[PDB]
Write a protein that binds this DNA or RNA. Structure first.
Ligand SMILES: Nc1ncnc2c1ncn2[C@@H]1O[C@H](COP(=O)(O)OP(=O)(O)OP(=O)(O)O)[C@@H](O)[C@H]1O
Ligand SMILES: Nc1ncnc2c1ncn2[C@@H]1O[C@H](COP(=O)(O)OP(=O)(O)OP(=O)(O)O)[C@@H](O)[C@H]1O
Ligand SMILES: [Mg+2]
Ligand SMILES: [Mg+2]
Ligand SMILES: [Mn+2]
Ligand SMILES: [Mn+2]
Ligand SMILES: [Mn+2]
Ligand SMILES: [Mn+2]
Lengths: 453, 476, 459, 493
DNA sequence: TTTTTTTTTTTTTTTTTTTTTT
DNA sequence: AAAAAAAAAAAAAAAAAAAAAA
């Protein structure tokens, strides 16, 4: 199965734009310890950028790149590079270049061409694709996991860790991509962008209707008055200029009315039927999507529950589950056979633990072909008991998922007590320390395991 | 027990005391230290020449104040005495105690009166840690009550130096290897890394004894110490790090040495290995004859009963309910609370204390339940089981296992398909179902961005065209 | 300077609705510890509800009350009582009653009448207010601080702790009511709400005007055709039914056209002129408001500047500052906190770590509860050391110790700290200020309880 | 010093060793246990009969493995010896050591060879705090290397049982009180809750020495324990918890005893208190004459230079810039670095090393600078200074504390409604709405909560002034928007 | 040089809960 | 009981804009 080997950050965020910081990942555990502002989260941001191609949240102004105003130069060029082996066993490397060219007034951010190569056993360097559009699709395809799993479950951001307990629309949007049902959700959003414009048009047609009706009134009356004047003239012949005037008015002003108007009416009718059909299909093609969501959610709930049972060290909540049925999409908690929505009715530590459990349960049902998961500060707002139980549970997960091909747990923390219960020294002989140098750039070291306290 | 023969070296063997385990527990909080005091008192009044401790004297790498103070209390009340020990150290201790300036055994120190020298190695829990790489046994060695031996300065080139004793005419070589990581220890043993300097002078009458603290058998590929990587010149191996007690000696055929596994004194985990009765062993080395061994059971181990059941193996239990599973589990825990209380009372009334019924100390009870669904029934939901922390909180006051009396474990149409079956229902009045399901199918699979707008716009224009050619449609 | 003394919870969140747990807040330090799901934050939620009178965020199902779905009773009532002392040394008590009926599957939430008594030195109980709406204005006035200070600064919720690093509009909203300038913002919202209506009217007017134009295009033509037919008849008299028909059409269809249309047009013009006049004053009543936000927040930046320097243990950021400048189209206001990394100014939001944005938030709240909270010396820190490393935990503890020493030479000062971690307790020198700490626990029936324990019992 | 008189009891007094301060610091990580070892060596070969420690032997509540190891190695090497201790015990030890089954002094133990007993009370740092209330000295008492005395069980009632010693013809009474919170022992002393068990025989012959570890002076009203609560029969007081080494015996005129403030062995906080020369003292009790003190300086204490300046006093320092003051602070720190190095070299080449040159230990440097704004200018911005840690990282390789060389400190409704809006009001300049009615239309709105006060004001204008303009027929004939504005402005004037 | 696309930010609809009036 | 506005807080949706595809 797939596995990551090495990462080579350069010029990104806190890092130096004239260096090449390298961190190598080992099996089955990787430990990253540093201070505040070292660059620990930037490593995971770079991993996610290499694997999927999307920047961290709230990075509009090119803040992912090493700041030009700090360095003082103008043309900055970052480059994240990752070495990994595919699910089938092939060895591959992916490169991603970006630029932050700065003008006098504004700074322009652009993404240069990347590179993916499948290096054989004898160093047979053969490129697969170069443009970043296909680089965002080949790498998740080679790893084996969908692109959503890589950015919500495996390399989840530190500030977006608690996504399972967010608004219902956010949960539905994030489970649409995990379940590979985003295609149909975009088809619905495109069928909605056919009703929108349509509606506007209908709104125009209606106005026109009024006007047209007025014009239609102005033609039957003149034809009846002409007939009344004609039959009066016929009576006087048996015993004209009013007809001539009314006929000229009908020929100039009220000519092609009976059917021009006909077609208008037709159009209106068409619009009316176009409405109902867009809605009706949308309702049926969305009930099917939610049915698929709820059908593909049973296996996740079965391993959410077994993880919660042996990890939560408390006597209030029995189990926890995610259930679908806008989009009454939520995670509920059971307190002695009663169901209550967890959101707005829990605490900070329980929310943190629920999010960790949900991500770990999604990692082993969809990331079965990619045994990688990165936990960025797992022990926040957790008491001593839950820290110990979480460490023991992670140890059990590592043991269980090692008769598989591999399992790579990247742990980022500076809470010393969490290391003890997981036996960090029993799984690795070293760890990596991130620290600023005397010029404020970040460095990644290689420290012996016993030298941590 | 009567004094040994002047040519007989009697040693008490203990390991895996784990002093400091569950220190803050309100009930079983002193369990570990009390058992260690009993072990070190079963040596003071058993007239042992010395005792050897095969690692894990402390549960943590940095022992607390109460752990350290209660281990210094027994080491001072049981080792210090006026009767001089009869062991003469033949070797040079500086090659064995090379860490500091305290380069000799404690009983040779003029400032200390030691009647029982305690020799110990480090384990996988109380190992070297810090900037100075100080073990917890190095802080006891400074005190002068224990002598830590068998350190590993460099973990890739290991050289084991013995301690050479002799009592009259019986000699003894005490080899000791600390607890190093098994992945690296195997990698070192594989390529001529670990060496032993067997004594060269008058070889043939030594009793070669070794203390190890590695895994005997590993579940993984290469994470245990093979019992075949040792030297054939050994006569007995004292295997630590394994918590199951084996009162006998497993004679290793091809290497001609007996492996002893003393187990542990405290139960740091409630498993089937730690439900076996615990012992501490007494060797008797005598030149010319076999080393007879006497296991003396510990009388301070808290009573432990274990049962591991499977819910799918018992009938009349249906997964849908919970009120009938937690009634059978209660009846299964309550019978082995009585089974353990009966054992505790019988053992308390089997040592001369049979004329009084005291307040029995609470036992340690564990029920490991497998709440897996049976094979025949193919449903997502398995058996329903109550919260383990709250289920076992209803036995408080009757069991020393406060919060963990039961442990539950498990034994070991992609859209379109279902979307195509919905087509029949969705009955529109202008748009054809077949062209629209296929207008979206094409949109989805073939990635043709503009298809659903165009199909709608085209089918509109055809339906407008058909309605406009009927003049009767415009009069209604 | 005001001070809180004793709080009693009953029925709120995990607390039992048939019992009552109390906690006494000592000076100058209060410690609350417990496990996850104990009720530590519910204490701060109830304090904030007692003083200001607003429920915790995301509590629209009546989930601030002990849920009746697990107890099995229909009518359930909660109560929160705080015994504080006024700013000018007056012992008062506030009570807050809440009801949650569950008749059918729908649950109804209601706030019954409370009471604010002001006990004299002779136990003269005198309920001076009963309406909860009155209480929300009385209690903050008696404490001495504005209501917005007690919501975001003093008794800030745990989930809203990092509010100084939120979106610019969400930041100006918080700072608007802190500076007591929300009244003119309400006026601006009103001058915006009328505008829209007027715009709609303009639209209507326009349509009407078009119609009027059509009528004004017509009528005169008939008048010209009538005059042409009249002068032809006058010529034939010197040598009618077409005029009669056109005159009847003018009398029935095109009668009162000349004035009407014109006045409609005038109305439209008026609307246009109201658009200009409503906008001009409005873009000035905002320039005189944000000129006051950046004028009042001047001694606030002096205290963030000297708290940051003495607390942040790092080599990158020199100081932090809050800048409130006008503006791009779609950003409303440029209200954000900036950081100076070696005398270059960078916005802190989007390029700061999880620990730096926690320390900045704590420091900003501390600097706010020194200038606009000088009449009420209370500050409730809930898990201060989240994502803070060893050095920052130690320096924050030292800085809190320095604040306690400095602000207590003056009148009353209290500092509630909720935490569960050993390093902060060790570094802060907790035992040198109190002899006890309250420990929240859940009993055998899942009901939270508060216990008074020894100081030397926290291992 | 040589062998004391057989009638003399010689004591080495030390306190506040803090073995464990800056344990992990790369440079000054071994300055605590090394100087404790130097103290115990100055006790071994000065032939002192006993050493009494008066608090804070360890910096932390749970000492580490390096601190315990180094203290045990120090005690084992220079406390044990063949020479018997010549002190004779007269009291029952069980009354003083009332904690365990080790109820006798270490040097009277049949299976130890203690030649110089080390006593000692607990401090406010290494105090008893655990499940069973064990302090770090109760561990050392279990090893037999020190004898921890003066341990309080209950804070409300205190009984102080002394240790009674006799050498030759000289008797000693060692009183000891642990370190309990000052603002509670104050209450206990206040209501007669502290008692001293004086010896019953031969009043007027004992040297009553007491080791107290409380705050000597309270700068705030409630911060300390006074010397007026201590009894008058005492002959000497050894005050701990105070790091400022006063090498003289401060005589109390009314209670008739001498206070001693030894100080500390290591500087735990860089300030002026720990910038005085530090000593360990030697007492020479003998019956017949007064005791004679003898301070002996410590020679393993890192050279510490302390300067404190206020930035505003120096002229030519404009607060707006942050580089003309940085260039001044840099040169001040580099000036007082060379003074520290000169003193280090002058003290290292004056003990027997006047011919060999070695790398001097890096000094401790601390400059306190007051970046307060001058009294003349009241601008919110004071002196601008850079990051304290990055400023102190410029001296790495020349200073022991590379992160705290410099410390910065300070030596200390709605803007009248439309008051600020008034300016804008007059400059608003609209062309239909009157300014006065609108500022007052909003004042009323904001001021007297009239929710719709604004609302109607504007809508009177879309009434009153409609018709009013509808009354000028000339206004309706002009399609030019500039003539329309000129007409409206002329009707307003 | 011009057009789709994704991300933030701000603005809106719903739905209870008060508050009015009785 | 009974109803009819106001206030306000969550959840979902619509502009603005800079990057990327054309
Ligand atoms: N675009 C940028 N240019 C320069 N510096 C930046 C940029 N973005 C962030 N930084 C700085 O780099 C650091 C970011 O590192 P990061 O956020 O990964 O630290 P961290 O290890 O996550 O810290 P924490 O422990 O608080 O989570 C911050 O100190 C930030 O100020
Ligand atoms: N409306 C409610 N009814 C009944 N029980 C509730 C309700 N809301 C919350 N609870 C339970 O009571 C607990 C109280 O939460 P609280 O905020 O006190 O936890 P905490 O003390 O903050 O601990 P931590 O912050 O570590 O999670 C909740 O976590 C939840 O388990
Ligand atoms: Mg981070
Ligand atoms: Mg909380
Ligand atoms: Mn063990
Ligand atoms: Mn072991
Ligand atoms: Mn002290
Ligand atoms: Mn001190």
């Amino acid at each position: 199965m797939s596995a990551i080997y090495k990462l080579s950050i350069q010029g990104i965020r806190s890092f130096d734009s004239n260096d090449r910081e390298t961190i190598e990942f080992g099996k089955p555990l990787t430990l990253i310890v540093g201070m505040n502002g070292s660059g620990k989260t930037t490593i995971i941001e770079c991993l996610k950028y290499a694997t999927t191609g999307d920047l961290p949240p709230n990075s509009k102004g090119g803040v992912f790149i090493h700041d030009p105003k700090i360095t003082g130069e103008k043309d900055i060029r970052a480059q994240v590079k990752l070495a990994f082996t595919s699910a089938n066993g092939l060895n591959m490397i992916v490169t991603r270049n970006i630029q932050l060219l700065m003008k006098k007034t504004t700074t322009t951010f652009k993404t240069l061409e990347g590179q993916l190569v499948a290096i054989n056993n004898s160093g047979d360097r053969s490129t697969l694709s170069t443009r970043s559009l296909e680089l965002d699709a080949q790498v998740p395809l080679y790893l084996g996991v969908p692109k959503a799993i890589l950015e919500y479950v495996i390399f989840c951001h530190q500030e977006d860790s608690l996504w399972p307990l967010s608004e219902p629309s956010n949960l539905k949007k994030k489970f649409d991509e995990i379940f590979q049902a985003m295609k149909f959700t975009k088809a619905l959003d495109n069928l909605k962008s056919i009703k929108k414009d349509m509606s506007v048009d209908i709104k125009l047609l209606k106005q026109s209707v009024e006007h047209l009706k007025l014009d239609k009134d102005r033609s039957k009356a003149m034809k009846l008055n002409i007939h009344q004047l004609q039959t009066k003239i016929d009576q006087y012949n048996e015993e004209q200029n009013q007809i001539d005037s009314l006929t000229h008015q009908l020929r100039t002003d009220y000519k092609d009315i009976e059917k021009n108007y006909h077609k208008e009416w037709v159009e209106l009718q068409t619009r009316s039927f176009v409405t109902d059909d867009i809605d009706v299909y949308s309702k049926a093609l969305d009930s099917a999507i939610m049915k698929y969501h709820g059908l593909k959610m049973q296996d996740i709930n079965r391993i959410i529950d077994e993880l919660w049972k042996r990890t939560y060290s408390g006597t209030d909540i029995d189990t926890i589950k995610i259930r679908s049925d806008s989009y009454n999409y939520r995670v509920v908690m059971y307190k002695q056979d009663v169901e209550l929505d967890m959101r707005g009715r829990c605490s900070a530590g329980q929310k943190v633990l629920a999010s960790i459990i949900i991500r770990l349960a999604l990692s082993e049902t969809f990331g079965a072909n990619c045994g990688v998961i990165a936990l960025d500060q797992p022990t926040t707002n957790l008491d001593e008991e839950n820290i110990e139980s979480l460490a023991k549970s992670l140890h059990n997960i590592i043991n269980m998922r090692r008769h598989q091909k591999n399992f790579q747990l990247i742990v980022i923390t500076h809470d010393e007590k969490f290391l003890g219960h997981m036996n960090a020294a029993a799984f690795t002989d070293h760890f990596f320390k991130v620290k600023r140098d005397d010029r404020q750039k970040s460095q990644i070291e290689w420290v012996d395991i016993n030298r941590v306290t | 027990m009567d004094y040994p023969d002047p040519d007989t070296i009697r040693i008490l063997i203990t390991t895996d005391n784990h002093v400091g385990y569950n220190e803050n527990d309100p009930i079983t909080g002193d369990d570990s230290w009390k058992t260690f005091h009993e072990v070190m008192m079963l040596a003071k009044n058993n007239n042992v020449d010395m005792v050897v401790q095969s690692g894990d004297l402390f549960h943590v790498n940095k022992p607390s104040k109460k752990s350290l103070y209660q281990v210094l209390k027994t080491l001072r009340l049981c080792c210090m005495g006026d009767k001089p020990c009869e062991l003469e150290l033949l070797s040079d201790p500086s090659q064995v105690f090379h860490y500091d300036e305290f380069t000799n055994v404690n009983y040779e120190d003029p400032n200390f009166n030691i009647s029982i020298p305690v020799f110990g190695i480090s384990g996988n829990h109380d190992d070297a840690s810090g900037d100075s790489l100080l073990c917890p046994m190095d802080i006891l060695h400074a005190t002068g009550l224990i002598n830590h031996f068998g350190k590993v300065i460099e973990s890739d080139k290991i050289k084991v130096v013995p301690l050479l004793f002799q009592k009259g005419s019986t000699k003894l070589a005490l080899y000791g290897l600390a607890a190093v990581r098994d992945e690296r220890l195997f990698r070192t043993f594989k390529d001529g890394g670990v060496t032993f300097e067997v004594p060269t002078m008058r070889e043939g009458e030594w009793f070669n004894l070794m203390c190890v603290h590695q895994n005997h058998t590993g579940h993984t590929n290469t994470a245990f110490l093979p019992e075949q990587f040792l030297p054939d010149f050994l006569d007995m191996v004292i295997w630590g790090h394994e918590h199951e007690c084996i009162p006998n000696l497993v004679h290793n055929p091809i290497k001609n040495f007996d492996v002893l596994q003393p187990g542990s004194s405290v139960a740091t985990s409630l498993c089937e290995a730690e439900a076996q009765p615990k012992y501490v062993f007494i060797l008797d080395i005598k030149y010319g004859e076999a080393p007879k061994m006497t296991p003396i059971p510990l009388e301070t181990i808290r009573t432990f009963k274990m049962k591991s059941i499977s819910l799918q193996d018992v009938p009349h239990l249906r997964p849908h309910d919970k009120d009938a599973t937690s009634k059978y589990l209660i009846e299964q825990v309550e019978e082995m609370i009585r089974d353990a209380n009966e054992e505790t009372k019988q053992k308390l009334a089997d040592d001369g204390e049979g004329d009084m019924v005291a307040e029995l100390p609470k036992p340690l009870i564990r029920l490991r339940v497998d709440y897996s669904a049976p094979s025949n029934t193919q449903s997502p939901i398995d058996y329903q089981v109550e919260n383990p922390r709250r289920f076992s909180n209803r036995f408080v006051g009757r069991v020393a296992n406060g919060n963990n009396v039961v442990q539950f474990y498990k034994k070991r149409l992609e859209v379109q398909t279902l979307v195509n079956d919905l087509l029949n229902k969705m009955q529109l009045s202008l748009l054809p179902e077949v062209g629209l399901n296929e207008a979206v199918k094409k949109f989805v699979d073939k990635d043709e961005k503009t298809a659903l707008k165009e199909f709608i716009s085209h089918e509109i224009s055809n339906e407008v065209g058909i309605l406009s050619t009927n003049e009767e449609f415009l009069r209604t």
